[PDB]
Design a protein around this ligand. Structure first.
Ligand SMILES: [Cl-]
Lengths: 195, 195
């Protein structure tokens, strides 16, 4: 095999964060959150800060709950204009690369796609019906709050065939469902990566 | 929307991408090699600080067509060059935005895709045959040097149906053909934009 459970977890953590730069001085955490939340609920944000000037240094690190959200944010939020500036989005610059590469390779063995911006009223069966228009589905599951049981606005769908997942991503990314636009992309990690 | 002069000014802006966070040791040659897969580089405007006799860490790469800049923006952002994750964005200058928006809207009326990194040995009919696997094609044309008649490694393909063009982009971007990987994407301008 490759990567101790501990190594894999460290990689997953790094893969869940995106660097955001060129942030207008007047913009704060709440603006960033609003702009990046469509890709998955924000776990936390580490904003730069200067004690002498009493302001952030123009950049921040947004952390998501899963790697897939960071991947979509990276592909869709770069150069978007915020506060009059084109923000920059990238992967953290900080030995984890080989593990990250291994996870990406392992993910290709599944026809799994990540779906974000899922309206609160949609259920697992609702998402499944819609997405099975692209092909037979092995499983469709929305992530849920461990306490409430309410889904967190995102989930994963596994198809029996690769062509089905490819078609789904191409047709459903930015699809307007329930008033919001879904953010869809191929998985970048296998399911249960630390197993 | 916009006269011929306004549209051409927009097309010019749309053909350039900002490249930032360039390692001090890297020069024009490295940038060109890294960005050429999306279309042949027309020119590069590199920042310059003579006092220290070094560039300022950023440059503007100009392509022959807007589609190449679009692909470069979607595929080169955060790529690691010289140990640094480069940043790619649209020029911050631009009153041209409304015209750019108009061109994007007009482009959606055609099922046109841009194909870059086309090996020199491929011909128009070669490209057509390959791509017609996705659907009936109205035209497949590689851009050619006005003097030699040799294609410049890129072209445009128009499909009769939108689903065909969508399938082609999804299936052919990064497709290994003739030793290189094709760079494919939807057109961002209508054909003959200033007509
Ligand atoms: Cl080949």
């Amino acid at each position: 095999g490759r990567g101790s459970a501990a190594q894999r977890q460290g990689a997953l953590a790094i893969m869940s964060r995106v660097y955001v730069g060129s942030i207008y001085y007047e913009l704060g955490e709440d603006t960033i959150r609003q702009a990046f939340a469509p890709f998955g609920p924000i776990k936390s944000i580490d904003m730069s800060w200067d004690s002498v000037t009493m302001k952030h240094k123009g950049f921040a690190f947004v952390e998501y709950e899963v790697p897939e959200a960071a991947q979509l944010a990276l592909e869709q939020m770069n150069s978007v204009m915020l506060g009059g500036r084109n923000i920059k989005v990238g992967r953290p610059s900080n030995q984890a690369q080989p593990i990250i590469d291994q996870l990406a390779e392992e993910a290709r063995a599944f026809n799994r796609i990540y779906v974000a911006s899922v309206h609160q009223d949609l259920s697992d069966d609702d998402i499944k019906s819609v997405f099975e228009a692209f092909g037979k589905i092995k499983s469709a599951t929305l992530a849920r709050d461990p306490t409430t049981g309410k889904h967190k606005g995102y989930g994963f769908i596994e198809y029996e065939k690769a062509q089905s997942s490819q078609d789904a991503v191409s047709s459903m990314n930015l699809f307007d469902l329930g008033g919001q636009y879904l953010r869809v992309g191929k998985a970048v990690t296998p399911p249960m990566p630390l197993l």
